[PDB]
Amino acid sequence: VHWSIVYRQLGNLLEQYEVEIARLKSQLVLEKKLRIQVEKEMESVKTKQ
Amino acid sequence: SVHWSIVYRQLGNLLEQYEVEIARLKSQLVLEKKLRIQVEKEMESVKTK
Amino acid sequence: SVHWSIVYRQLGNLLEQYEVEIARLKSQLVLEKKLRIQVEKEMESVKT
Amino acid sequence: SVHWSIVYRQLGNLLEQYEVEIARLKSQLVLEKKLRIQVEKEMESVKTKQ
C-alpha cells in the first residue's frame, strides 16, 4: 500500500510525542514546586519546637 | 541541493530523541511523585507529634 | 532549532517529487521507444 | 503496536529504490534518444542522396 499512509502515521506519532512531552514537563515542574513547598513548611514547623 | 538521506536521517533522529525524552521524563516523574509522597507522609507525622 | 514539522514536510516533498519523476521518465521512455521503433522500420524500408 | 522504526526503515528503503530507479530510467532514456537521433540523421542524409 502507498507510502503516504505510513508517512502520515509517522507524522501523527510526532504530534503525539510533542504534546506528551509538553504535558510531562508541565506535570514535572508542578509536582516539584508543590513538594518543595511542603518540605519548607515542614522545616519551619519543626523549628517551632 | 541536499541528498535525501540527510533529511531522512534528521527525521529519524527526531523520532528517536522524542521517544527517549519521553521515557526519561516519565522515570523522572515516577521519582518526583515518590519524593512528594515521602515528604507529605513525614509532614503528616510531624503534624501529629 | 527547527520544528520537527519542517523536516517531516521536506521528506514528504522528496518522496512525492521522486514518485512524480519516475512516472514522468517512464511516460517519456514509452514515447521515445515508439519513435525509435518507427524510425528504424522506416530506415529498413529505405535501405531496399 | 509496531515500532515506528520498522515503518521508517521501509520508507528509507523505498527512497533507495527510487533513487536507483531514477538513475536507471534516465540512463535508458538518454541512450534511446541518442540512438534514435543517430538513425534519423542517417536516414536524412541517405534519402537526400537517392
Swiss-Prot record, chain A:
What changing residue 26 to A does, per the record, is: Wild-type phosphorylation pattern
Record's subcellular location: Nucleus; Chromosome
Q: Which residues form the signal peptide?
A: none
Q: How does it assemble?
A: Interacts (when phosphorylated) with nbs1; promoting recruitment to DSBs.
* Protein's job: Endonuclease that cooperates with the MRN complex in processing meiotic and mitotic double-strand breaks by allowing the endonucleolytic removal of rec12 from the break sites and ensuring both resection and intrachromosomal association of the broken ends. Specifically promotes the endonuclease activity of the MRN complex to clear DNA ends containing protein adducts: recruited to DSBs by nbs1 following phosphorylation, and promotes the endonuclease of rad32 to clear protein-DNA adducts and generate clean double-strand break ends.
User: According to its UniProt record, which protein family does this protein belong to?
Assistant: Belongs to the COM1/SAE2/CtIP family.
State the name under which the record lists this protein. DNA endonuclease ctp1
Give the species: Schizosaccharomyces pombe (strain 972 / ATCC 24843)
